[PDB]
Amino acid sequence: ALNKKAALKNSQLSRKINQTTFSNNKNTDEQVTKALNLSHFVGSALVVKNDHVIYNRAFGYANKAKNQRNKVNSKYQILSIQKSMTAVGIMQLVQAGKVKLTDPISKYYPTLKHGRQTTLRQMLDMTTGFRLKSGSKEFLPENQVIDFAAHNVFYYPDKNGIYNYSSVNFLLLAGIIRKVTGQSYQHFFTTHFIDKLNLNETGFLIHGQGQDATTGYRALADQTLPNYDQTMPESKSQMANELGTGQVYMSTADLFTVESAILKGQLLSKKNVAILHTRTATGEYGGGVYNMSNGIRSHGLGYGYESSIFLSPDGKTGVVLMSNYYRKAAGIQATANKIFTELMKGDI
């Protein structure tokens, strides 16, 4: 219907994006702003080159009703980009000698009837046959979010060992962090990421964003322009059910800091970062990110938000775009991809 039309409009936007020039004898602000304006971007945009911020600008409204404009320090949902952080949490446990990537899931989830042999390595690479079709419709504490998933997950033998995206893999990994450490995931995340890296605009949505908050907006089918006519709800249960997988908010700077710190070896040895970030035979995905010849990427979608990061192998050069106004017909990822490609060539 309009669904199909929206995919087509987005293809056409990617076309116009991909055919924009980009020269380094022209002002960075002007060129990036032109590309963001093409997609009618709403949110905040960060471009870093050899660790220097070269573009940092916000567009549209954090909360239109309250006349609050998005700011460079606005907070957005990182969504699935949190999986890369859960992945690093697991590999920290590997480095500390507390788990192995060859461990079978049945070591941690003894009640599972099928897929018991599935390794932690496979869960980290999206090469498992597990799927959770939906979480609990009522708010559950972490231990019960984990219990729900372990008892409600499907297993598909056809999908064992081949890349197929399934979020429950990372919820279950978060439950393994809980079991091994005896800590909550929220506490683990706070000490290992928030405290460690001095993140001041990072937290869990279930506890509120505080200052510089944003509101998620709902687009009607096939719309490209932001009208802010409808907010997108997210219940407490939906936030709880994103344990390990998409329950965190960050500023663009805080997201860049985490992903960069990972690659620079600040949280985990460079050797273990490389072991973690290893693609598979069937997919670029490995260890919670997509692995490319020219760095990593991760993308998130939900609750009216979209998030995107592209980052160079050494962590010093990249693009973060986050939006509180997802539109299928005006996605942000192709824009971030093009900026990153140009940035890595030397064209900015």
Author numbering: 49 to 396
Text of the article:
We show that lipoteichoic acids (LTAs) but not wall teichoic acids are D-alanylated in Lactiplantibacillus plantarumNC8 cell envelope and demonstrate that DltE is a D-Ala carboxyesterase removing D-Ala from LTA. The domain consists of two subdomains, an α-β sandwich (residues 76–126 and 246–397) that form a five strand (β1–β5) antiparallel β-sheet flanked by 5 α-helices (α2, α9–α12) and an α-helix-rich region (residues 127–245) folding in 6 α-helices (α3-α8). DltE is structurally homologous to the D-Ala-D-Ala carboxypeptidase R61 (DDCP) from Streptomyces that exhibits the classical β-lactamase fold of PBPs.
Besides the apo form structure, we obtained two other DltE structures in complex with tartrate or TCEP (Tris(2-carboxyethyl)phosphine hydrochloride), two compounds arising from the crystallization conditions. Intriguingly, these two molecules are anchored by an interaction network that involves eight different residues, among which are the conserved active site nucleophile Ser128 and the base Tyr213 (Ser 62 and Tyr 159 in DDCP). Importantly, the catalytic Ser128 with the hydroxyl group of its side chain positioned at only 2.7 Å away from a carboxylic group of TCEP and tartrate is ideally placed as it would activate a substrate for the enzyme acylation event as described for DDCP. This suggests that the tartrate and TCEP molecule may mimic the nature and position of the natural substrate of DltE in its active site and that the acylation/deacylation step of the catalytic reaction is probably preserved in DltE. Three additional interactions specific to DltE are observed in the TCEP-bond structure and involved Tyr211, Arg345, and Gln381. Notably, a Tyr residue (Tyr338 in DltE) interacting with TCEP or tartrate replaces the conserved arginine (Arg285 in DDCP) in carboxypeptidases. This arginine is key for the recognition of the terminal carboxylate of the peptide substrate and the carboxypeptidase activity. Instead, residues specific to DltE (Tyr338, His347, Arg345, and Leu349) stabilize the TCEP or tartrate molecules. Taken collectively, our structural data suggest that DltE would not be able to recognize the D-Ala-D-Ala terminal end of a stem peptide as DDCP does and that DltE would not be a DD-carboxypeptidase.
